PDB file of C-alpha atoms in Angstrom:
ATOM      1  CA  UNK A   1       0.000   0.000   0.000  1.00 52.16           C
ATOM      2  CA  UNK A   2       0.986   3.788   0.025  1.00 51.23           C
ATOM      3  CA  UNK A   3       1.596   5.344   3.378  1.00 53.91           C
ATOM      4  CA  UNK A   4       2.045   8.943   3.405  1.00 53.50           C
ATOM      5  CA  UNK A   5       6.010   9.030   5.047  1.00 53.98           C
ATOM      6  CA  UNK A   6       4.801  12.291   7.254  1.00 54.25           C
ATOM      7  CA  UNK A   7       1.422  11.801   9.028  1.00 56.58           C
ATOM      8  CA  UNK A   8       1.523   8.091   8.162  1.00 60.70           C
ATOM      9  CA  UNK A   9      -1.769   7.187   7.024  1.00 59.96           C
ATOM     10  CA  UNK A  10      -2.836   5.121   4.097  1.00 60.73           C
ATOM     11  CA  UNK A  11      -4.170   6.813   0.256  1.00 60.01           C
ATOM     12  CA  UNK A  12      -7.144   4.727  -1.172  1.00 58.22           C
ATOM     13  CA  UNK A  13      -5.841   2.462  -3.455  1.00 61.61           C
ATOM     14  CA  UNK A  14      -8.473   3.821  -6.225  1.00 62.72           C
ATOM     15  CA  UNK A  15      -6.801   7.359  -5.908  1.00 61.91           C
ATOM     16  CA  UNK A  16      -3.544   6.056  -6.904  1.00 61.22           C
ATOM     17  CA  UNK A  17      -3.663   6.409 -10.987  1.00 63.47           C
ATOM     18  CA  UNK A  18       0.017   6.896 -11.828  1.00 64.75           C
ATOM     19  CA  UNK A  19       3.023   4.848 -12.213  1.00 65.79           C
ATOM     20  CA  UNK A  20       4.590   8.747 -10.587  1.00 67.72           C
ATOM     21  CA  UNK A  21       2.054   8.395  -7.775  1.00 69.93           C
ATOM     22  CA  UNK A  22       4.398   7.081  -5.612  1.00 70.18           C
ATOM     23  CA  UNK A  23       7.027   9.005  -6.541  1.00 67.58           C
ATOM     24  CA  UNK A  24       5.629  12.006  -5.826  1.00 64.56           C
ATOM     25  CA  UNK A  25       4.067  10.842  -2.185  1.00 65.26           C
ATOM     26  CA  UNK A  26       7.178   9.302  -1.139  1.00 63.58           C
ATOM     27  CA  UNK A  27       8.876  12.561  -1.340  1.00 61.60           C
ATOM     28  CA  UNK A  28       6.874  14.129   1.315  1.00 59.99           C
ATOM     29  CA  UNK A  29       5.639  16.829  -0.968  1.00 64.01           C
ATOM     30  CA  UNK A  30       2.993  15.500  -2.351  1.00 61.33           C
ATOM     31  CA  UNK A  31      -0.821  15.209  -0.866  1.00 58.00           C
ATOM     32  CA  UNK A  32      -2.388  12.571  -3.177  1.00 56.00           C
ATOM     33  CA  UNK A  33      -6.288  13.083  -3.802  1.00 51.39           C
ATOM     34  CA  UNK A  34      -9.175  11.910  -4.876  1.00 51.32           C
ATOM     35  CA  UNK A  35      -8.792  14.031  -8.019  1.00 52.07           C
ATOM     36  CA  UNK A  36      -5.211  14.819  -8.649  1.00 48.79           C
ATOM     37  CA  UNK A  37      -2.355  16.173  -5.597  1.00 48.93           C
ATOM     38  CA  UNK A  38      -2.041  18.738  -3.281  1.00 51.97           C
ATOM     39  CA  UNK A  39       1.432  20.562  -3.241  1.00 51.72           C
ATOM     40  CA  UNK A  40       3.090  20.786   0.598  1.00 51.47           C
ATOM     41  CA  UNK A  41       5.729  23.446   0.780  1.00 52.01           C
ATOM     42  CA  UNK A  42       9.631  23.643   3.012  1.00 52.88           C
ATOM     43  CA  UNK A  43       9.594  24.956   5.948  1.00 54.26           C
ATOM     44  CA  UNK A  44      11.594  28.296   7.227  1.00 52.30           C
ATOM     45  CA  UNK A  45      13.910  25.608   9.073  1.00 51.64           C
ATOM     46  CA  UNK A  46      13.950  23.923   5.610  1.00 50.21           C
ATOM     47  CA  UNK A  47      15.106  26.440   3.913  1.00 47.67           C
ATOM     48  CA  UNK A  48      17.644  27.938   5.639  1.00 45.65           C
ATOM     49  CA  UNK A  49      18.994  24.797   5.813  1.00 43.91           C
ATOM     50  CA  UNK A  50      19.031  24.617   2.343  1.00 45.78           C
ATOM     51  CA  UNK A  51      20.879  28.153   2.040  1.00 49.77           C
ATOM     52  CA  UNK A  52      23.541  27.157   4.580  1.00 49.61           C
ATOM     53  CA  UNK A  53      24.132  23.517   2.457  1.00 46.60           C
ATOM     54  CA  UNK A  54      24.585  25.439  -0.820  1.00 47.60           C
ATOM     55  CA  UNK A  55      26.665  28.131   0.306  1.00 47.91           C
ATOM     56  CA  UNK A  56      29.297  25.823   1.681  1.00 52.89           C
ATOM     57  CA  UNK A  57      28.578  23.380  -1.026  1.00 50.76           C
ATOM     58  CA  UNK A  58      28.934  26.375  -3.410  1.00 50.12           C
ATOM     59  CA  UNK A  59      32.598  27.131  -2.625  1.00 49.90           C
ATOM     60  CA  UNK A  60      33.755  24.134  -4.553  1.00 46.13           C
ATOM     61  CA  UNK A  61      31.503  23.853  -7.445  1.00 44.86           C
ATOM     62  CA  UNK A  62      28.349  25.779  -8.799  1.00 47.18           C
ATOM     63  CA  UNK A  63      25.207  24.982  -7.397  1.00 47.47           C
ATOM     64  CA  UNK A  64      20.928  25.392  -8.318  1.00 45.23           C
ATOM     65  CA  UNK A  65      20.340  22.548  -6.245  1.00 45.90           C
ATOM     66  CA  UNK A  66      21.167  20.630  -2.908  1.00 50.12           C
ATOM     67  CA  UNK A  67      19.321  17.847  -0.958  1.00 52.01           C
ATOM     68  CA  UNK A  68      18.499  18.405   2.452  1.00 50.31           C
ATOM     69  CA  UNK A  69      17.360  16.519   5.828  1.00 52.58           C
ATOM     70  CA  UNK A  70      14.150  17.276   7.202  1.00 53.20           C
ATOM     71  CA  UNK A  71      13.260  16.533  11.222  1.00 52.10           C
ATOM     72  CA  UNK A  72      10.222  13.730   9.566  1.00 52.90           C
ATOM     73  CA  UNK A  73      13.432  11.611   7.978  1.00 55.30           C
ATOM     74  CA  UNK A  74      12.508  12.749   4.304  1.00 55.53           C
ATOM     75  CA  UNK A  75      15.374  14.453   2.606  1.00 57.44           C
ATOM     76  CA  UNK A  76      14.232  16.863   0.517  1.00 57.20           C
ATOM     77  CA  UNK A  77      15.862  18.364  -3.128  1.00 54.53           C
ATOM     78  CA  UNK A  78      15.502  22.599  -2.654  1.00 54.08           C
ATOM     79  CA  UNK A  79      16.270  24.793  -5.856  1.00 54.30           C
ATOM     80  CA  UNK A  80      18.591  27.583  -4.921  1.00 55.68           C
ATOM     81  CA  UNK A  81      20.568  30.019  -6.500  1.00 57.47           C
ATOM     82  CA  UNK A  82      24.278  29.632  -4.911  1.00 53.97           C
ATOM     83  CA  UNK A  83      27.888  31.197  -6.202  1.00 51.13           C
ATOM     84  CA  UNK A  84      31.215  31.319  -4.067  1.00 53.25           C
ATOM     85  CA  UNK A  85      30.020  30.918  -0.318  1.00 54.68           C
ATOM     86  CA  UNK A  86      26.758  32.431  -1.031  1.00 54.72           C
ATOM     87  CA  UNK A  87      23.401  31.324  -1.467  1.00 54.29           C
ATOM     88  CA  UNK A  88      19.894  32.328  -1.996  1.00 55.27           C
ATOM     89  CA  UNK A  89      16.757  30.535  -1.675  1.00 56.52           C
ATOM     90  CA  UNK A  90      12.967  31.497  -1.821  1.00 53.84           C
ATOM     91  CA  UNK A  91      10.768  29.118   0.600  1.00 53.97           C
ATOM     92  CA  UNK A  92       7.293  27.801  -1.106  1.00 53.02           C
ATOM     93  CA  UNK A  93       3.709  26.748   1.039  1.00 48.61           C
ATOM     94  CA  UNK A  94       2.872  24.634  -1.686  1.00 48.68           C
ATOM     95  CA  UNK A  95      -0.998  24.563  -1.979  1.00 48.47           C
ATOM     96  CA  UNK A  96      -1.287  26.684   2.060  1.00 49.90           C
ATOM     97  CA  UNK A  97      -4.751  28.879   0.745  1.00 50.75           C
ATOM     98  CA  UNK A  98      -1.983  31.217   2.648  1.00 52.72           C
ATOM     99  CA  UNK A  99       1.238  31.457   4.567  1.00 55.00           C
ATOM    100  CA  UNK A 100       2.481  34.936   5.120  1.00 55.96           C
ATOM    101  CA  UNK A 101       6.539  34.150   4.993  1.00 57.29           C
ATOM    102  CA  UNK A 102       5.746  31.870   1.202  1.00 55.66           C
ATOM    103  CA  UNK A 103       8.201  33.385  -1.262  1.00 55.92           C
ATOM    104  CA  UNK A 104      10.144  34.714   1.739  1.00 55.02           C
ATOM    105  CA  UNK A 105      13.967  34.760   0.776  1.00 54.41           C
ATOM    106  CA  UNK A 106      16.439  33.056   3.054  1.00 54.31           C
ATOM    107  CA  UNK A 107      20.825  34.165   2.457  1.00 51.87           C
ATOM    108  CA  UNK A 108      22.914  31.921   3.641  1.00 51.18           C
ATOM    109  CA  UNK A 109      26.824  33.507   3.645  1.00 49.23           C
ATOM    110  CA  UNK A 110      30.000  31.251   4.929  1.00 50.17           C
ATOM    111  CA  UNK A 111      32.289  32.808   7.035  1.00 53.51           C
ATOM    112  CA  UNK A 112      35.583  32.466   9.004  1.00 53.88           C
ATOM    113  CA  UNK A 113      34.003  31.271  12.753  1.00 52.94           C
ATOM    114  CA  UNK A 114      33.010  27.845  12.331  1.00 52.21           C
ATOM    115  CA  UNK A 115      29.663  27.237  13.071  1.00 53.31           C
ATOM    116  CA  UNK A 116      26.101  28.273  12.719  1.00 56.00           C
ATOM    117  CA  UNK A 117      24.765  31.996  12.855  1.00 59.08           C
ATOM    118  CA  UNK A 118      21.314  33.699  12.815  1.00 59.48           C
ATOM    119  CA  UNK A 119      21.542  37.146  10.688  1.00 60.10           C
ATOM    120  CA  UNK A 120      19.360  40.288   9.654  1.00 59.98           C
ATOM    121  CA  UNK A 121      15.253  39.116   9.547  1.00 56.96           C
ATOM    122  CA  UNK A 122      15.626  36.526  12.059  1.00 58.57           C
ATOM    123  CA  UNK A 123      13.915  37.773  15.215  1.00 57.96           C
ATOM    124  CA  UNK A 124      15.331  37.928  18.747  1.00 60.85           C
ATOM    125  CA  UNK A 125      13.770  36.600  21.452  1.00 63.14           C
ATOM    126  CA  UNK A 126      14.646  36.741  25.514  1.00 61.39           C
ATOM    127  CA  UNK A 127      18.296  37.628  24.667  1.00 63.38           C
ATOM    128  CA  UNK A 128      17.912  34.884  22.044  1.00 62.92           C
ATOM    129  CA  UNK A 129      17.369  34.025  18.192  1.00 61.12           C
ATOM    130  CA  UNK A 130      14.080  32.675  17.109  1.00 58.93           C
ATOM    131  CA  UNK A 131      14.812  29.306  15.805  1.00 58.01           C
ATOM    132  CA  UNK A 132      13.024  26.293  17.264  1.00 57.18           C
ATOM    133  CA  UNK A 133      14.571  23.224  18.664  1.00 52.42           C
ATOM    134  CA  UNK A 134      13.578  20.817  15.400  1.00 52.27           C
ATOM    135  CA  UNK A 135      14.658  23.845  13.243  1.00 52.44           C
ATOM    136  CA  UNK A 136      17.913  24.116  14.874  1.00 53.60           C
ATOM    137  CA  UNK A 137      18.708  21.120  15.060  1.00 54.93           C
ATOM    138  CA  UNK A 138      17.548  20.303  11.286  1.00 55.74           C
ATOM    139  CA  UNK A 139      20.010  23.404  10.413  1.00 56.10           C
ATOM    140  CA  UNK A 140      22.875  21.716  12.275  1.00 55.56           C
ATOM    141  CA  UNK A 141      22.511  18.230  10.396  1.00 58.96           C
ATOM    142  CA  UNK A 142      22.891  19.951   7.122  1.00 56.10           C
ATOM    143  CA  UNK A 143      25.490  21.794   8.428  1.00 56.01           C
ATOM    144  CA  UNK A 144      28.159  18.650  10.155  1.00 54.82           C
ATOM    145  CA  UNK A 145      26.369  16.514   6.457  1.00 52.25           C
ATOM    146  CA  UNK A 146      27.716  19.859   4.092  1.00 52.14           C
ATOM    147  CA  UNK A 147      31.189  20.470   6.307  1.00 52.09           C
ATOM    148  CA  UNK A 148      32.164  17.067   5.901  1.00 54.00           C
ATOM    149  CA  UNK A 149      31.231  16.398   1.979  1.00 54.43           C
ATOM    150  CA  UNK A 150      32.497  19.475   1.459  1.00 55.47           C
ATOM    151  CA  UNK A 151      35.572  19.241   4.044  1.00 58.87           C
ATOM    152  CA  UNK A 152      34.393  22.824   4.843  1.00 57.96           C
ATOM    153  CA  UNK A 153      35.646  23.732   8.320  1.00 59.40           C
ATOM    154  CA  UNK A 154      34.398  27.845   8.615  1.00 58.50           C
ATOM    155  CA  UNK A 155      30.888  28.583   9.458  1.00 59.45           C
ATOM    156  CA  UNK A 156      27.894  29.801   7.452  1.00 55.82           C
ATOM    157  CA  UNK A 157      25.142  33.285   8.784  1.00 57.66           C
ATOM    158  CA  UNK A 158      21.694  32.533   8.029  1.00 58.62           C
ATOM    159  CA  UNK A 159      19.672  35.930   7.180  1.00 55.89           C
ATOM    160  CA  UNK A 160      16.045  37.004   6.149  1.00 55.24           C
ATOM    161  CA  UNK A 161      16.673  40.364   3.826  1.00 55.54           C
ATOM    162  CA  UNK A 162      12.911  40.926   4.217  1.00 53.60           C
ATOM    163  CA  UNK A 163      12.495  39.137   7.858  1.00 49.71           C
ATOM    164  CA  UNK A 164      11.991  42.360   9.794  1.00 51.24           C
ATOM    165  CA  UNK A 165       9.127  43.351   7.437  1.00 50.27           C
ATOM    166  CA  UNK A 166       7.415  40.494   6.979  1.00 48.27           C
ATOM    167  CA  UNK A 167       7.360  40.124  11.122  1.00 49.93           C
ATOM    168  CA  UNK A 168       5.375  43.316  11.083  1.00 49.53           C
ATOM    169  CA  UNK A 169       2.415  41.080   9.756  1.00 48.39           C
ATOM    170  CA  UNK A 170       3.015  37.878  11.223  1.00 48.43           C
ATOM    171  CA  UNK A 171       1.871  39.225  14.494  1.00 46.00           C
ATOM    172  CA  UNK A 172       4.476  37.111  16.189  1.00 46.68           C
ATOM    173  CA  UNK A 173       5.658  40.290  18.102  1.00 47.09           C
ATOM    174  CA  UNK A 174       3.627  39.703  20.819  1.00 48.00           C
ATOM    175  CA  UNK A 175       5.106  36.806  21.526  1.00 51.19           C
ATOM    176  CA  UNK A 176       7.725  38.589  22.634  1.00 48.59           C
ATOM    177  CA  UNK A 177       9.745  37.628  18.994  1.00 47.59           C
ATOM    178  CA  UNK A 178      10.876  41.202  17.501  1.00 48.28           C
ATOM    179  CA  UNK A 179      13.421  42.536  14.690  1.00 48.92           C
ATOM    180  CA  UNK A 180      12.710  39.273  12.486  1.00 49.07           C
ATOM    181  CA  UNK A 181      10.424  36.442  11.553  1.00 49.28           C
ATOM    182  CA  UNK A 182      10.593  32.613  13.335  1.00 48.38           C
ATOM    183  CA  UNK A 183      12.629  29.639  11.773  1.00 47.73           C
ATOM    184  CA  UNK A 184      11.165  26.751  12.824  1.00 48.82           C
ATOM    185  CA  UNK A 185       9.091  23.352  11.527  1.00 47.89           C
ATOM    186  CA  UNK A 186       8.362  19.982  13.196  1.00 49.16           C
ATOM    187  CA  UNK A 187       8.520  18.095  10.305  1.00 50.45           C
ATOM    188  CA  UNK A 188      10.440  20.169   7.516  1.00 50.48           C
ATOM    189  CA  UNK A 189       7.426  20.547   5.611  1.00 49.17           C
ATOM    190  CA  UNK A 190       4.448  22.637   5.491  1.00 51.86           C
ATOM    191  CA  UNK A 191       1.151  21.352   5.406  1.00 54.80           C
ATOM    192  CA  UNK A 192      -0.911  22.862   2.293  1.00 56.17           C
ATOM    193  CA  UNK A 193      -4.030  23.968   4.317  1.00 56.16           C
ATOM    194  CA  UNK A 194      -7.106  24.555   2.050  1.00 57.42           C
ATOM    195  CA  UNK A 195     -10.587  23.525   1.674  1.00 56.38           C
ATOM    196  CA  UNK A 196      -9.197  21.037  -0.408  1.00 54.80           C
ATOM    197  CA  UNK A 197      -7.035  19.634   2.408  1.00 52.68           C
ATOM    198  CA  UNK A 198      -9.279  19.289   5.037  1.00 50.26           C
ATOM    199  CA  UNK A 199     -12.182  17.332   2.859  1.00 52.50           C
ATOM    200  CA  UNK A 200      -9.455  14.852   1.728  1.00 51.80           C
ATOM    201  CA  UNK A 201      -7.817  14.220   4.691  1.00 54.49           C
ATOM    202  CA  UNK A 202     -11.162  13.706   6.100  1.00 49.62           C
ATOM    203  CA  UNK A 203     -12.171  11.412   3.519  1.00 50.70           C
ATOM    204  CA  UNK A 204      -8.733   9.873   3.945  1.00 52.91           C
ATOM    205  CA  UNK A 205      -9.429   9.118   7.817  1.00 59.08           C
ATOM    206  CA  UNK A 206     -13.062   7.377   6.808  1.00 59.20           C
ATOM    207  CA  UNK A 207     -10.402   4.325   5.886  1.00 57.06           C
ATOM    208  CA  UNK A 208     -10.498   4.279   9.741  1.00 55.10           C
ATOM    209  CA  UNK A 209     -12.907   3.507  12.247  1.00 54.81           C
ATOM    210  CA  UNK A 210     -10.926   4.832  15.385  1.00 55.23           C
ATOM    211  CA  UNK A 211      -9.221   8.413  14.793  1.00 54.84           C
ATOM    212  CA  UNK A 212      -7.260  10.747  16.775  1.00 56.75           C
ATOM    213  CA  UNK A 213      -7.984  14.305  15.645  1.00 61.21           C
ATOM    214  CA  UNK A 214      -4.864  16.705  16.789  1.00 60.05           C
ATOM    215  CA  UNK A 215      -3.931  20.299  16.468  1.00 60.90           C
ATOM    216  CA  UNK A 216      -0.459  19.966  15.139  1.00 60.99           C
ATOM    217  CA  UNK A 217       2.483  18.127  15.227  1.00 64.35           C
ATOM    218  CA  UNK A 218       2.938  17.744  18.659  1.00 65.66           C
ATOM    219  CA  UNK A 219      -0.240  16.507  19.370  1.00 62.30           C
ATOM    220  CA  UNK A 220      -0.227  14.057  17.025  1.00 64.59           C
ATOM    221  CA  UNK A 221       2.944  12.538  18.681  1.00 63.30           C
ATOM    222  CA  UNK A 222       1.226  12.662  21.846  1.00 62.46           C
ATOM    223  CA  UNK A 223      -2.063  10.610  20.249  1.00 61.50           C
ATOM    224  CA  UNK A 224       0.175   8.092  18.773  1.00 61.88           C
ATOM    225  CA  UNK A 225       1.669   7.598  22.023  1.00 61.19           C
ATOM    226  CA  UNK A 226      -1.406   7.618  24.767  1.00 57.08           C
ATOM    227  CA  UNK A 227      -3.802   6.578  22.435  1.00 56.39           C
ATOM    228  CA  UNK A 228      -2.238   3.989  19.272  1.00 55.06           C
ATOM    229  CA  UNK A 229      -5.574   2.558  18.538  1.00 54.55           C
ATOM    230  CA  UNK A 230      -6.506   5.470  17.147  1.00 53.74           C
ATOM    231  CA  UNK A 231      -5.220   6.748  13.664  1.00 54.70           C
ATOM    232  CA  UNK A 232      -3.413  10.116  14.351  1.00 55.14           C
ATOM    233  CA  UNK A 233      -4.765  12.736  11.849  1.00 50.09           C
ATOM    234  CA  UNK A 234      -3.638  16.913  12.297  1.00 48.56           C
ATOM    235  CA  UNK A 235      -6.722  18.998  11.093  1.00 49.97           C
ATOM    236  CA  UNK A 236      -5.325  21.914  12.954  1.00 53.57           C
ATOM    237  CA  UNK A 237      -8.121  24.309  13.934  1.00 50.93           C
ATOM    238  CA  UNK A 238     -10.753  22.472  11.590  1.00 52.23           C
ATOM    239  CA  UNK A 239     -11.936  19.913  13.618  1.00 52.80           C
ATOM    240  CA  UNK A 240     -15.276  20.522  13.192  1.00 50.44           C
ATOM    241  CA  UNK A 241     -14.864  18.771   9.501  1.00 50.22           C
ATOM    242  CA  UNK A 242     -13.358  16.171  11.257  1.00 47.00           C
ATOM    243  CA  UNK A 243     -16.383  15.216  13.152  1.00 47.21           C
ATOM    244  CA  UNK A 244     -17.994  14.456  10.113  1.00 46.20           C
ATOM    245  CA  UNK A 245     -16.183  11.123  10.551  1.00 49.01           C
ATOM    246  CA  UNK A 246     -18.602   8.695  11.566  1.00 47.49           C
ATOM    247  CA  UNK A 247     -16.852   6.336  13.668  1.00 43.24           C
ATOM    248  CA  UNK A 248     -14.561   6.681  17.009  1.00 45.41           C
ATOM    249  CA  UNK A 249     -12.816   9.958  17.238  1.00 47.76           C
ATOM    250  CA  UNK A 250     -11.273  11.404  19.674  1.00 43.56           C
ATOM    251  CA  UNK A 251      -9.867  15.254  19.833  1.00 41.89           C
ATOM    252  CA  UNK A 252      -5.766  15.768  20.766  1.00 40.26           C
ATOM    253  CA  UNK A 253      -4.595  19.601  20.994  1.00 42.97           C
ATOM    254  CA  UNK A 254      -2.826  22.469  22.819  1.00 43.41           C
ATOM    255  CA  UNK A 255      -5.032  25.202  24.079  1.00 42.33           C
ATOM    256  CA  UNK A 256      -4.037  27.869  21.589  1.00 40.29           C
ATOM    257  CA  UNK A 257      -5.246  26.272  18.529  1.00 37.25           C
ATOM    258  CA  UNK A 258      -8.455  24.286  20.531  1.00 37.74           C
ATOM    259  CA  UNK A 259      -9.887  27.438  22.096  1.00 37.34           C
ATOM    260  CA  UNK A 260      -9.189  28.843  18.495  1.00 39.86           C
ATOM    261  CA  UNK A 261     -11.338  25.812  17.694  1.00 35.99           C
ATOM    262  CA  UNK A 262     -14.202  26.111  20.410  1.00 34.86           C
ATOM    263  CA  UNK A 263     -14.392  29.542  20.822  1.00 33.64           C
ATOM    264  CA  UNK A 264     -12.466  29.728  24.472  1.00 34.31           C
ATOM    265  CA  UNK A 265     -11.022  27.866  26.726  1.00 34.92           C
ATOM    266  CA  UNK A 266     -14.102  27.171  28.508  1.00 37.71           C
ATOM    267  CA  UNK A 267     -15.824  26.161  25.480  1.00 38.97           C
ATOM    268  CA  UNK A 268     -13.749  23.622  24.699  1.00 41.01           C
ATOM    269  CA  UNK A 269     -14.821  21.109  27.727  1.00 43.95           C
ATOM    270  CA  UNK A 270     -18.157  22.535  27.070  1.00 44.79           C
ATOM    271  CA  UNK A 271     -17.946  21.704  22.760  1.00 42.77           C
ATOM    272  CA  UNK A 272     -16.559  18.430  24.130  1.00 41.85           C
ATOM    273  CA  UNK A 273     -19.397  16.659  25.932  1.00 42.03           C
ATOM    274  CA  UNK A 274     -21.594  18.496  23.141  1.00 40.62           C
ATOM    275  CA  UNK A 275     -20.144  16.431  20.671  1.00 38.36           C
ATOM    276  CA  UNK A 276     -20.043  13.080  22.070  1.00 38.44           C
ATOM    277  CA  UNK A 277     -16.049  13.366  21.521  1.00 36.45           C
ATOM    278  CA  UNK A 278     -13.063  12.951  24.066  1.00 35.33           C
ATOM    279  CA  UNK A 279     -11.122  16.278  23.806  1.00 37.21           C
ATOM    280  CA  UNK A 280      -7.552  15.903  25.521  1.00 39.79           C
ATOM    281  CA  UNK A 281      -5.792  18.943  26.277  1.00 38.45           C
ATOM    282  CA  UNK A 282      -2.050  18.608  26.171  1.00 42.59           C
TER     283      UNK A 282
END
């Protein structure tokens, strides 16, 4: 059968029309539907990772592509536009109806301190630089994979030209995040949310009669965990589509995105028993 190699569930096997089908799914950016695919994009982790891997690879060789690690275990070919220690490269959302940092560029320069710095765009938070722990830690894969193909030995700066500008929109300045946009991504993708996502990964889930519906990533590691029975599915704030499943279901989220959901945090508990459906807060 065809698993997706992200969120792990099966694609009906009368969707899959295409010797490329699998191709295309096993790469981890493609959404196979009913009627053709749905496009996921990189990440902001993803692709600075990509700009630090063609800088360095850049230095001994042109480059307008490199082949990156993402946190999910799917390495991932990025198109870039790299020359002598410097490189340039535009992140996509795929088929996202609409992510404010798609088409955002990402510089990646090499320099003479070995290791891995966060430029211009990249916003500073608590004395620190915005990048989250599966971002960083994507970034730093690249980085030992790159210095060691490349037996590079400096370092490389990772900057957002446009990252203090696009923050002004992104809101994420009351988070306490300011001069510059996030990097992060749990998975190294980007899930393409649309109308069209959210009916065929519901349709998708009707494969299964037990179903864990969770906010994100996060939660959908904790639902594989506590509750394994259940197939783990992220519908993010549209779990009210969700519920059109008719078998066992069972609601896994954080309380930003299920009070998003509900309507507060009160009405959560409150949407809960007035659904018939479990809702675990995490």
């Amino acid at each position: 059968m065809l698993i997706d190699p992200i969120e792990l569930y099966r694609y009906p096997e009368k969707w899959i029309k295409d010797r490329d089908a699998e191709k295309k799914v096993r790469s981890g950016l493609y959404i196979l539907t009913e009627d053709g695919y749905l496009r996921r994009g990189i990440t902001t982790g993803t692709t600075a990772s990509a700009a630090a891997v063609a800088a360095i690879a850049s230095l001994k060789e042109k480059v307008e592509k490199v082949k990156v690690s993402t946190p999910a275990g799917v390495d991932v070919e990025v198109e870039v536009e790299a020359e002598k220690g410097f490189a340039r490269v535009r992140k996509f959302s795929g088929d996202h109806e609409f992510d404010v940092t798609n088409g955002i560029i990402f510089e990646a320069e090499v320099c003479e301190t070995s290791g891995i710095f966060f430029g211009r765009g990249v916003g500073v938070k608590a004395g620190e630089k915005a990048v989250s722990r599966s971002a960083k830690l994507q970034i730093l894969e690249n980085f030992i994979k790159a210095s060691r193909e490349f037996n590079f030995s400096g370092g490389v700066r990772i900057s957002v030209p446009d990252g203090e500008e696009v923050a002004k929109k992104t809101g994420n300045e009351k988070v306490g995040i300011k001069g510059g946009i996030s990097i992060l991504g749990t998975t190294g993708f980007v899930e393409p949310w649309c109308k069209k996502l959210v009916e065929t990964k519901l349709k998708i889930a009707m494969q299964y009669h037990r179903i864990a519906i969770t906010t994100g990533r996060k939660a959908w590691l904790y639902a594989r965990k506590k509750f394994p029975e259940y197939q783990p599915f992220v519908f993010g704030v549209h779990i009210d589509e969700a519920l059109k499943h008719p078998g066992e279901k069972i609601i896994v989220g954080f309380p930003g995105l299920l009070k998003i959901w509900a309507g507060s945090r009160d009405r959560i508990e409150e949407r809960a028993r007035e659904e018939g459906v479990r809702v675990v807060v995490i």
